[PDB]
């Protein structure tokens, strides 16, 4: 179908990115609420990224999963690109974090679970190494998790350590996340980027004493240096800490 700025009335900003801004917006024709994301061919060029785009767009365009944010259309004009996207009313897991500083284990476990399925399907169709920082998780109207990705702490040992990664990478992220949710910050934070290198090659981290065994078990298996040792998803899903907690309607 053919899109055009004119078929959208434009709403309030929801964020300003590097190449542009995302907005709330509605399709004049169905009154369909969604998000619009605005790029400037201009800044795209000078960061020569148009290559990074046109790919991921494609990719995205294809994917369909409840937990991954949808990309509906994309259209362009004179001097910026438009990206039509699903709107996620409840915002990002990143503010949710800032706000509760920390998540309880049911919330975490459940979010993991989503991720895991997401990650799985995304894998199935042969796609990997998403950045899944918390500011690339949005929330659905149900608080249903959902993901949208298009530094650092979330890189694994085999990537910083300039070596050979696969989709186990996705298992590490998931550890970091699960750690970050529960504790509040990510397990290899550090002040300079070179402490973080270090921290990550020795996988050097520690739990606060409020963190249950269930969790430390899981987390630990995910955060292993040898890609091969870490679980796989349906294992993770099948972990007990998870099943015990994962509210799953
Ligand atoms: O630019 C892209 N991704 C993307 C991902 C998320 C958002 N922004 C939102 C979209 C929908 N709901 C949202 N809800 C929000 O609450 C929000 C808050 C801050 C920033 C963005 C959003 C946001 C905008 C763009 C993109 C590029 C290539 C492929 C796919 C997506």
Query: Of residues 7, 104, 131, 153, which has the active-site annotation?
Result: 131
Token look-up 């550890």 returns 175
Q: Is 18 annotated as a binding residue?
A: yes
Secondary structure (3-state) at 141: coil
Given 91, 115, 137, the domain boundary residue is 91
Given 33, 63, 91, the domain boundary residue is 91
Judge if 242 and 228 occupy the same domain.
Answer: yes
Residues 13, 135, 18: CA angle, nearest 5 degrees:
55
Q: Which two tokens stand for residue 185?
A: 């910050």
Q: Which two tokens stand for residue 152?
A: 């650092």
Judge if 87 and 97 occupy the same domain.
Answer: no
Instruction: Provide the CATH number for the domain around residue 45.
Output: 3.30.200.20
Mutate to test the pocket of ligand 1, among 10, 47, 94, 148 (most ligand atoms within 8 A of CB): 148
Given 91, 106, 124, the domain boundary residue is 91
Token look-up 């290899």 returns 188
Judge whether 7 counts as a catalytic residue: no
Per-residue burial over 235-244, b = 16 or more CB atoms within 10 Å of its CB, e = otherwise: ebbebebbee
Method: X-ray
| DSSP conformation class of 192 | S
Residues 6+ apart with CB under 8 A from 75: 2, 3, 4, 5, 81, 82, 84
Judge if 216 and 182 occupy the same domain.
Answer: yes
Q: Which two tokens stand for residue 89?
A: 């009313």
Among protein residues, the one whose CA lies closest to atom 7 of ligand 1: 22
Judge if 229 and 109 occupy the same domain.
Answer: yes
Judge if 158 and 240 occupy the same domain.
Answer: yes
Structural resolution in Å:
3.2
Judge if 28 and 96 occupy the same domain.
Answer: no
CA distances from 30 to 6, 26, 84, 87 (A): 13, 8, 14, 15
- DSSP H or E stretch at residue 114: helix 105-124
Judge if 143 and 33 occupy the same domain.
Answer: no
Task: Compute, in angstroms, the gap from residue 90 CA to the centroid of ligand 1.
Answer: 12
Structural domain span for residue 97 = 92-246
């Amino acid at each position: 179908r053919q899109w055009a700025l004119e078929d959208f009335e434009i709403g309030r900003p929801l964020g300003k990115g590097k190449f542009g801004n995302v907005y709330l917006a509605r399709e004049k024709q169905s009154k369909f609420i969604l998000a619009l994301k605005v790029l400037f061919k201009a800044q795209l060029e000078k960061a020569g990224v148009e290559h990074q785009l046109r790919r991921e767009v494609e990719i995205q365009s294809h994917l369909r999963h409840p937990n991954i944010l949808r990309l509906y259309g994309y259209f362009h004009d004179a001097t910026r690109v438009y990206l039509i996207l699903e709107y996620a009313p409840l915002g990002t897991v990143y503010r949710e974090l800032q706000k509760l500083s920390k998540f309880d284990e049911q919330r975490t476990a459940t979010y993991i679970t989503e991720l895991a399925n997401a990650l799985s399907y995304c894998h199935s169709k042969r796609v990997i190494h998403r950045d899944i920082k918390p500011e690339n998780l949005l929330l659905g109207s149900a608080g249903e998790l959902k993901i949208a990705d298009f530094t650092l702490d979330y890189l694994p040992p085999e990537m910083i350590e300039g070596r050979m990664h696969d989709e186990k990478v996705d298992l590490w992220s998931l550890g970091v996340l699960c750690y970050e949710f529960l504790v509040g910050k990510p397990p290899f934070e550090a002040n300079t980027y070179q402490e973080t290198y270090k921290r990550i090659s020795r996988v050097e981290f520690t739990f606060p004493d409020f963190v249950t065994e269930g969790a430390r078990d899981l987390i630990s298996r995910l955060l292993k240096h040898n890609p091969s040792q870490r679980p796989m998803l349906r294992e993770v899903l099948e972990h007990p800490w998870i099943t015990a907690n994962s509210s799953k309607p």
